[PDB]
Design a protein around this ligand. Structure first.
Ligand code: PF7
Ligand code: PF7
Ligand code: CL
Lengths: 543, 541
């Protein structure tokens, strides 16, 4: 009794296949006409250079476009990141505003960015055969800014997992090792950009979903403050949940590409299409700024034990920043357990998961969601009871469960006030130390396919800054050595509960995979956060 | 009811002593300066006062104590001052010289935290619980050279557009003592409107900057809710975010509002409250004189306007036309739904239960009307009573049914609807390619104790709290005898008890001010101010 859903999957798949076929024919024809094109120089040019060469006219858009389109199709063979080819981009290609700061640049789009005439399924059956009526606001500016959006990239079912699988388009895989997860929910983007198949893309992040796949796939991402960019026309599962803001941001191969993307997005076209975004232009002076920083740091959040590879990544970065003349100050946000267990969990699931669970009636539940659906479906009394039984043995589990229960509007107000207060608390702690910026460990290396869904507590490094609504970004700094991988077999975890035990295992067999560091600033300080990410990049990956 | 009588007695002796201190102070100053022209000092516009302070032509002591004295006098008739911020003479000598508000005395609505003073809000439970530091906004006024000098009265719990409470009593309209000064920023309306402060700060969640400014014949702006910092404000409910609180300036002219905003939107604010987007005052947008595409309406088809409101609005329209702006009819869609389901649901999602906590044990002031008795009613009876009402009095039924406690699930739905509704109007706006929107503003002032029984009148202002657009108010005319006689033909659109109370309440108002409202898209407060300036210039030069 799941026939509408199997119907959905057959259509989704036949669509994907057709998309991928159109791409192939498009690129096959281009190559026939352009057999002397230096395809290697083109693909591996950094975005700034690619952009100037489009601007200068040294490269035509078609050159850069059809080259990339090709590489996209090829990496998809190994990764399954492309759900659909945005088929009207050859019209936008020739119509692409020449004065635009992204003139010529092919951009990949997470599947939840509305695009005229395409599904934003999110892997749910019920969003299939329901094409978006028009581009979303962000796509409209990208397009006005010269860019060429050309693919929708896979997401986990409902977007509420940091793996990347669904019953429609199936499962995306890490380009460095197909046994691993690309992370999620922006996994499609991570895998594509990560294997050279796109020079810039866009994802969303409400608990780490830009930073997770960026880190896992060896690329960069920024989650700006939630209302820096416009969420008009973005597809989601719940609407009207404002305790924890959704934030949307760029994913690229280097920091400078994130900066350009922000400057291009942060312009009059955006502010006029979405009046509700504050018209805060991109302060380049602050981005370009190069003075010594007061950098707070922690090696561990005392919640998720870092992997050896993570802590190496973090100490080595710290030590380089000191080398470079920045002041490194021990710092740890107060009451992280509260922040994750009561504030974030409570705001994400204030209604017990009822609104979210609706999306799943009649549909399959993808393996990479774990028991999330099972646990949300549990009645409130029983969630509470199970929570009390769990509490003495596994307190972390008890905490989360009990905060995933439905509440009254009265209790929501109280929660949202607490979130306001926690945010001020941390800002005060931050100013007490007079920090400029905050260096943090980032989850890594990639967990095995279908394991993120069972290691929820490892969302601690990223979700904190969704709760606080601070800008936060992720840059790659190192890769897992044999020594690191070995030390993992002694990994214990702070709680010793099912989530730590799975994580030990999910990070096994990781030698070679990219591991990241995290960069946070105060609200609306994206350009400082990005300035700081650039320093880390310059130091830790000089080339 | 002992605690409530005790708190009243305490409140009253605290207020009395402040006035004494004030008196003593001004009286010592005047002996030392018998030949200062206080008539000239007090009637200079803020911009010229400020320049004179900056040149040195005037001492900060001269302007401080001269305004302090006027405040004491005007308080005798209005009862607008609840407390003298007694430590402001230290601040006087400390005010940084480069500050854009150097030497300006500023009045504060009672709810802006001030180190060492209560923010009672008229509630007994808040009495004798002094604030322990200054709110961010008060800190930046000080870092900008201003001198906050008094807390001014509010209605009990701030949830009324009258201005009385069992603690400090009842504030009056300085134009006519039988009239309300409006509220909840009523104290500031009375004080500013009678010459006792050149600039004040108030807050607005459903009209509370705009009502008293209109009723008392001064200017005010309710910005986009998050343009300024609400870190440190005293309130009754916290973490209601569907309809945003907004704080903002009140003053005698539009330029005062503009300067004040230029003073607040600076690095001190953005550093003290990082949660506020650091948008500086775009001086070029405010100073611009390009012709404007002015959306307008004469009535929200919900609250029938007073003859004075109508004339005010049409006279303004006509002058803007004369000055070559394009005037385009425009009415946000679904106002009735916006007020009845979105705005009321947003403010009372929890049945008013959090609100009600604040009244446990206190008297309920008469100017709240029956808000409290209504909310104390159990949901099932609110729904039953709403059903009875619906056929003859839908507005009433509509509000009552929407003041019932809901789930978090239901609040998400309501929250999502507010978001969609905000975008639907932005879409209307852009379809007619408007810059700015001209609407009526409630007026003239209602009689004492009638606003709390005329909740329907909230429609003109609250629409834009719901939508979170910047809205400001400018006095444009005064009620004529022709205007006032005509109120005798006013009927209302619904004929319900709100329309009957309102009719009566707006009567006997010859000579009272009547405003017009200016609106702009979110984050467009400088354009909105540019529009307010133009309306001031044309209607009251
Ligand atoms: C991206 O922004 N995501 C996807 C990953 C998800 C992680 C997560 C999964 N399950 C729970 C259950 C309860 C509380 C918090 C979380 C987080 C965060 C959003
Ligand atoms: C200032 O922002 N205020 C003071 C006046 C108050 C008016 C008001 C009173 N009662 C109800 C009941 C239901 C819905 C709306 C209102 C508004 C608005 C806020
Ligand atoms: Cl905002």
């Amino acid at each position: 009794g799941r026939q509408k859903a199997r119907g959905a999957a057959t259509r989704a798949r036949q669509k994907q296949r057709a998309s991928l076929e159109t791409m192939d024919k498009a690129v096959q024809r281009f190559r026939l006409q352009n057999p002397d094109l230096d395809s290697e120089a083109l693909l591996t040019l950094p975005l700034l250079q690619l952009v100037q060469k489009l601007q200068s006219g040294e490269l035509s858009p078609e050159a850069v476009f059809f080259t990339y389109l090709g590489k996209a199709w090829e990496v998809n063979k190994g990764t399954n990141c492309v759900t659909s080819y945005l088929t009207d981009c050859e019209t936008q290609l020739s119509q692409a505003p020449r004065q635009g700061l992204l003139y010529g640049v092919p951009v990949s789009l997470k599947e939840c960015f509305s695009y005229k005439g395409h599904d934003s399924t999110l892997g749910l059956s019920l969003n299939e055969g329901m094409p978006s009526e028009s581009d979303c606001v962000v796509v409209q500016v990208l397009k006005l800014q010269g860019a060429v959006p050309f693919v929708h990239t896979n997401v986990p079912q409902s977007m509420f997992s940091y793996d990347c699988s669904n019953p429609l388009f199936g499962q995306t895989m890490n380009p460095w090792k197909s046994s691993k997860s690309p992370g999620g929910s922006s996994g499609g983007e991570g895998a594509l950009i990560g294997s050279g198949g796109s020079p810039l893309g866009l994802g969303t992040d409400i608990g780490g979903s830009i930073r997770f796949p960026s880190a896992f796939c060896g690329i960069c991402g920024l989650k700006p403050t939630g209302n820096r960019l416009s969420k008009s026309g973005l597809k989601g599962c719940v609407y009207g949940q404002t305790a924890v803001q959704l934030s949307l941001g760029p994913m690229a191969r280097d920091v400078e590409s994130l900066a350009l993307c922000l400057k291009a997005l942060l312009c009059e076209h955006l502010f006029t299409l979405d009046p509700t975004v504050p018209p805060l232009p991109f302060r380049e002076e602050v981005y370009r700024s190069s003075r010594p920083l007061r950098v707070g740091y922690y090696e561990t959040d005392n919640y998720t034990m870092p992997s050896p590879a993570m802590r190496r990544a973090l100490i080595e970065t710290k030590q380089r920043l000191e080398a470079a003349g920045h002041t490194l100050i021990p710092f740890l946000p107060n009451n992280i357990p509260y922040a994750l267990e009561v504030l974030s969990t409570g705001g994400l699931f204030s209604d017990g998961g009822r609104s979210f669970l609706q999306n799943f009636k009649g549909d399959f539940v993808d393996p990479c969601l774990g028991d999330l659906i099972l646990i949300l479906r549990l009645p409130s009394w029983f969630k509470r009871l199970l929570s009390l039984l769990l509490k003495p043995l596994f307190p972390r589990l008890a905490a989360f469960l009990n905060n995933m229960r439905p509440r009254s509007a009265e209790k929501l107000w109280k929660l949202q006030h607490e979130i306001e207060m926690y945010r001020q608390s941390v800002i005060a702690q931050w100013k007490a130390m007079n920090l400029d910026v905050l260096l943090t460990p980032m989850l890594g290396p990639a967990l095995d396919l279908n394991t993120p869904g069972r290691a929820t507590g490892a969302v601690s490094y990223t979700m904190l800054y969704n709760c606080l609504d601070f800008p936060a970004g992720v840059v790659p700094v190192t890769t897992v050595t044999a020594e690191d991988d070995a030390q993992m077999e002694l990994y214990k975890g702070y709680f010793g509960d099912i989530w730590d035990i799975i994580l030990k295992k999910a990070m096994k067999n990781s030698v070679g995979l990219p591991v990241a560091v995290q960069c946070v600033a105060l609200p609306w300080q994206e350009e400082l956060c990005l300035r700081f990410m650039r320093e880390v990049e310059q130091l830790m990956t000089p080339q």
